[PDB]
């Protein structure tokens, strides 16, 4: 019966800090859900910015024969489009890893 | 013919704005369908994961499991078709 | 915090009287009700700023 | 011999009781159940006796 006393104290300690590990795991799962929600909101906002920039450029490029002009804003818009493409792809990679 | 040509273009433009509004609403409806099918996959696969923790003879090749495999395959085909519809829209 | 404290408190109970009484099911309902309440408060907070 | 057969039925009873608890918790699992999460490859993974 002292062997039984040994075994019950041993198993009770196993129970107890299994319980502690379970509590920490649940709290970290909560914060993981909140982070992936933030990632999805960011992706749809960057999609909106891409909409705006590319609409501006295609509305601009219908200009008449004399005023087809290579201003600084055209080059800035092209750079902005590929910058937000890189941003969007990085956000999808982080979403898959999370 | 400038006046009635301009009126024809004006009618075309007004109805085009109407139809684009309906297509945008269609896009949002396909998005809502996609996210609810994702939640249904979550429920079915969590149930299938928890079910296989049984004791030794209780691991049973039940018609429930032979149906849950077709559940996961059918919801996979559903979400694939709805993604295709989103690209087409 | 008080619901999780009472749930962990009722696990010190000695093995004859370690019970699933009327208190346990109502505390489980309390925990789920509190979490549902504060999650829905978070979602209406999200609606407000939009 | 009677003690032997009684113990065999008692261990089978323990197995049925634990499997009953598992299938009960699987049965009441609805959507919005606050216990679900994704699982990958479970559609192929099985041990089956």
């Amino acid at each position: 019966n002292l062997a039984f006393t040994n075994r019950i104290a041993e198993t009770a300690d196993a129970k107890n800090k299994i319980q502690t590990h379970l509590a920490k795991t649940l709290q970290e799962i909560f914060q993981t859900e909140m982070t992936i929600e933030s990632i999805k909101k960011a992706i749809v906002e960057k999609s909106a910015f891409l909409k705006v920039a590319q609409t501006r450029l295609d509305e601009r490029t219908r200009r008449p024969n004399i005023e087809l002009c290579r201003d600084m804003a055209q080059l800035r818009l092209v750079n902005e489009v590929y910058e937000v493409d890189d941003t969007i792809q990085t956000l999808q990679q982080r979403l898959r890893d999370a | 013919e400038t006046a009635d040509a301009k009126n024809k273009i004006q009618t075309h433009l007004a109805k085009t704005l109407q139809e684009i509004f309906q297509t945008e609403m269609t896009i949002e409806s396909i998005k809502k369908a996609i996210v609810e099918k994702s939640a249904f996959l979550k429920v079915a696969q969590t149930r299938l994961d928890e079910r296989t923790r049984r004791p030794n003879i209780e691991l049973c090749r039940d018609m429930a499991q032979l149906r849950l495999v077709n559940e996961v395959y059918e919801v996979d085909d559903t979400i694939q078709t709805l993604q295709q519809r989103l690209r087409d829209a | 915090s008080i619901v999780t404290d009472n749930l962990q408190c009722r696990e010190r109970r000695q093995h004859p009287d370690l019970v699933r009484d009327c208190v346990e099911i109502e505390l489980l309902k309390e925990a789920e009700l509190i979490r549902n309440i504060q999650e829905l408060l978070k979602r209406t907070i999200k609606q407000a700023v939009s | 011999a009677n003690r032997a057969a009684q113990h065999e039925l008692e261990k089978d009873l323990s197995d049925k009781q634990s499997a009953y608890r598992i299938d009960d918790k699987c049965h009441h699992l609805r959507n919005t159940s606050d216990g679900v999460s994704y699982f990958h490859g479970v559609e192929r993974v099985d041990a089956t006796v």
Partner: peptide, 17 residues
């Protein structure tokens, strides 16, 4: 409304009795 899209992973745990 009804939280039909979000599922957290936890409950107030007691196993079997």
């Amino acid at each position: 409304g009804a939280h039909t899209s979000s599922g957290l992973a936890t409950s107030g745990f007691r196993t079997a009795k």
